[PDB]
Structure formats: structure tokens, C-alpha cells
């Protein structure tokens, strides 16, 4: 595996280079939008983001080393988490707003709103922590590998745990270079990882919401989103 042989700085450079682009929505100020129409924009946007996410995951060190079925499982489990942490990262410099797209800035308006408030709080957290881009790409890669880690073997889990340990070292390395004391490093590391718990929660809440509007037959869900959503159906 090339991942386990990477230095901390190379790991960062690899993750930075693998970053997907920020996509635009179809939002038009002159066009009226219902609650349905807004979900349509978010659905359409997320659908196009997924195709970029899949190709991003391939460039995440260690991910390609896994079997296809394990790559599928991890993406199925983590896709909404990864979208949301991207959304929260983009929304940092916009207090009280969520930047779904450069042409789509939404505030606390459209009822749903509970998840918005949770996303807003997370963004507030990123801002107060002064989260760095290098830390962000580390967090997003951790989510991809961790969110679905828990036959015969399936000593793949060991490989994933190895990479996870590698990304941990990278985070600490980043904080150390940032001039943080040992105590500040451990504290910030813990702070960053506890956010993944809130991201997990928001994803689970969002998945329930997406399931609701599916059965409501209100918003045209894409073929891929229908697959990703169905994977969480229990």
C-alpha cells in the first residue's frame, strides 16, 4: 500500500489535490421556489456532487486498496456525512447561513429547519475553532473510512485502522507545526473528532428526512441517490 508509506506532508498534499470542486446550483432569484422546489435544487446539487465524491474517494490514500464491495459499503454509509461536512466547511465565513453553492446561500428559512440549525451550529464550531483546510481534508477522509468500518477475512478492517492511525499522526503533525503545545494538540484533536459525532447525527437525521419526502412522492430523487438512500433503509 502506498498510503502507509506516505509522510504526513505528502498525505496532506495528496488529500488537498484530491479535493472535489465547489459546484453551482440551478437557483434563480427571479424564479419562485416552494418547499418542494428548494429540495429539488438540493437534490440535484447533491446528485452531481456524488459523482465528484466517488472519484475523490479513489484518490484518498488506502481506499483503492480495498475490495470493490468494501468501497461501496463505505461510500453508502458516509455519503451524506461527507456532503454535510463539505457544506459546513463552505459555510464557515457566512455566520447564520449555509453555502450550499456560491449562488445558493440559505439562512434559517424553509420548513428540516432543525437540521439547518444543527448544520449552522457545526459551522459556528468550525469558525470558533478556526478550522484549517488541512484539518478539514483529514476529517473528511476519516469519515469515509470510519463511518462504515463496523465474513472471513476481511483483514481489510486492519488496513483501514492503519490508514486511520496515519491520518491521526497527520493531524497531530499539523497541530505541532502550527505551534500548539502537547496539551493543546490533544485537546484540539479531541475537539475535531467529537465533531464527527455530530456530523454522524446530522446525517442520520437527514437520511430520515430524505426518506420522508421520497415516500411523499414530492421531489424527484435521482437514480443514484435512491440507491445510496436505500442502503440505509432498515
Amino acid at each position: 500500500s502506498l498510503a502507509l508509506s506516505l509522510t504526513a506532508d505528502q498525505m496532506v498534499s495528496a488529500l488537498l489535490d484530491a479535493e472535489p470542486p465547489i459546484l453551482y446550483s440551478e437557483y434563480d432569484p427571479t424564479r419562485p421556489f416552494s418547499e418542494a422546489s428548494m429540495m429539488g435544487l438540493l437534490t440535484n446539487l447533491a446528485d452531481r456532487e456524488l459523482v465528484h465524491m466517488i472519484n475523490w474517494a479513489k484518490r484518498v490514500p488506502g481506499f483503492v486498496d480495498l475490495t470493490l464491495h468494501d468501497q461501496v459499503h463505505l461510500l453508502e454509509c458516509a455519503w451524506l456525512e461527507i456532503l454535510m461536512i463539505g457544506l459546513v466547511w463552505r459555510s464557515m465565513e457566512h455566520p447564520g447561513k449555509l453555502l450550499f453553492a456560491p449562488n445558493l446561500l440559505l439562512d434559517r428559512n424553509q420548513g428540516m429547519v432543525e437540521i439547518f440549525d444543527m448544520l449552522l451550529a457545526t459551522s459556528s464550531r468550525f469558525r470558533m475553532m478556526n478550522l484549517q483546510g488541512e484539518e478539514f481534508v483529514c476529517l473528511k477522509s476519516i469519515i469515509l473510512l470510519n463511518s462504515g468500518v463496523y465474513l472471513k477475512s476481511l483483514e481489510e478492517k486492519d488496513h483501514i485502522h492503519r490508514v486511520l492511525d496515519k491520518i491521526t499522526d497527520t493531524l497531530i503533525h499539523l497541530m505541532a507545526k502550527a505551534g500548539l503545545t502537547l496539551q493543546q494538540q490533544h485537546q484540539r484533536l479531541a475537539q475535531l473528532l467529537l465533531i464527527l459525532s455530530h456530523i454522524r447525527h446530522m446525517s442520520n437525521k437527514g437520511m430520515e428526512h430524505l426518506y420522508s419526502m421520497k415516500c411523499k412522492n414530492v421531489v424527484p430523487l435521482s437514480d443514484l441517490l435512491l440507491e445510496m438512500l436505500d442502503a440505509h433503509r432498515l
Binding site: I54, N55, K58, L68, V72, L75, E227
Partner: peptide
């Protein structure tokens, strides 16, 4: 499925 396919393409 679509995800397995897109992951497989190269």
C-alpha cells in the same frame, strides 16, 4: 448498481 459501476470505471 450505479455506485459499484462508477467506482469500477477507469
Amino acid at each position: 448498481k450505479i455506485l459499484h459501476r462508477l467506482l469500477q470505471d477507469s
